[PDB]
Symmetry: C3
């Protein structure tokens, strides 16, 4: 569910046309967020800390409309009503993962419990990229994707680039939560299309994620 | 144009091989992010009732002017050119141009007046004063790379007791090695710390 | 040849769908930077009058050798090859080859002698020990990516009482996931202490 954007109106007409013919219209950024609050809440509730920051990220993307803009399969700029989550869930100790979809819910408890059921249902073996190729086959780009590396603190991860117009959707990476000057912080990297998102929206995204994580 | 500039004699150019190495790369650019101490400049700008932004804008612009490698470009015909002097573009958003002056106070004065209102002899810095980051990697317009360096400045932050800010840049690797990057950041920090 | 190497049977390979996902991409590579503690190695190198450079160079080469994913290459004909063993290139600039040995002291000895003087079974590390950085993203030679992993080592710096240093790298996502990157950095840090 989405709107075809009237390019002639739309405040980013000129921003988007600037990057239209770029070899690489994407930018990657890594920043750090405090997350001590969500870690305490997760520990106390006996819950997955992963789902707490997954929610934080998914909610910020939904709440800042610039993060809902996509170049659809037919090459048209569209704005999705709602953005869901793809994430590569590790299934084996040698790194095997299976990518799967998590629906956004505005109520954390609802999101949390649907998330948990999805993870419990994850197949023992599987095609690591089936879920992504399904969304591409469907033409559903109303998604973001986050990959966790909970045992690695990084200062930079850049994204891959599928095609000239850029990836179909935003790609994110979460890293290890670590005490820095007495506060728990974790790194989050992302790759976005610069036609849709400037520094200013990235600032609000990270501010927003950190607010949820506390 | 109407810019000072020199067409480079490739055959007597000290970076002939360095540049030729990269010439058919799909992506000949590197991105680097580092951070610089900036407490001295924060304090000087506070004392003078001045824009902190223009202090670090100038620090960056001066460093690039003092390291020749930061002033090499590929003109519209694909020829290597050296610019004697480099000005600053910055989205204030409206992208505005700031001429370089050897003299901070002159630079500052002219920049304030400008704000109140194939030339590749430029760098562009984009500021996001509310966003700290450990990395930004920039766009790439065309195969041969962007027309000029693209920089990003982020939030000044107290890290182990010292005010530091991140500066990312994307440059063409044929012009610039790790040695020049190191001199660049060192010069920006010397002006700011 | 005469390398111990294997032409991978993609249809029966555990990474078939991983590799096939990335292999047609405009950019199938990813860049990562992370910091590793290295106080122990700095100390041990000091105590033994050794090159510290060679300690971390070794830690990196050893980590890549021990994780098979870091040894997969795309040969000149576009075929996936797995090298049993991998050596090190490093600009010393003379880009010089350092053969891997399982034993550190042996590697050290040979490396010191070497300095005093379509093969993709290699990684290349470029050290800039006076350059502090939080991020470097590398270049890309062709659509299919670089021929082998490119790395950058930066300045050793104290963070909250621990000596740490940044190591950046560019890899093919067809061969290497976050899981393997996490293991790579863990092994490097385990050696450097």
């Amino acid at each position: 569910m989405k709107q075809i954007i009237d390019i002639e109106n739309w405040e980013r007409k000129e921003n988007f046309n600037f990057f239209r013919h770029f070899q690489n219209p994407q930018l990657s950024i890594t920043s750090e967020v405090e997350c001590g609050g969500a870690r305490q809440r997760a520990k106390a509730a006996g819950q997955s800390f992963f789902l707490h920051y997954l929610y934080a990220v998914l909610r910020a993307a939904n709440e800042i409309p610039e993060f809902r803009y996509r170049i659809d399969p037919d090459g048209r700029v569209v704005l999705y009503d709602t953005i869901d989550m793809l994430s590569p869930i590790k299934i084996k100790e040698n790194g095997k993962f299976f990518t799967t979809r998590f629906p956004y819910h505005n109520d954390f408890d609802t999101f949390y419990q649907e998330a948990r059921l999805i993870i419990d249902a994850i197949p023992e073996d599987g095609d690591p990229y089936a879920a992504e190729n399904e969304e591409v086959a469907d033409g559903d780009y109303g998604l973001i994707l986050l990959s966790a590396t909970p045992d690695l603190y990084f200062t930079s991860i850049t994204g891959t680039q599928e095609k000239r117009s850029g990836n179909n959707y935003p790609l994110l990476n979460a890293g290890k939560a670590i005490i820095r000057e007495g506060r728990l912080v974790m790194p989050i990297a992302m790759t976005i299309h610069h036609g849709f998102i400037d520094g200013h929206h990235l600032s609000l995204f990270y501010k927003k994620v950190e607010d949820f994580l506390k």
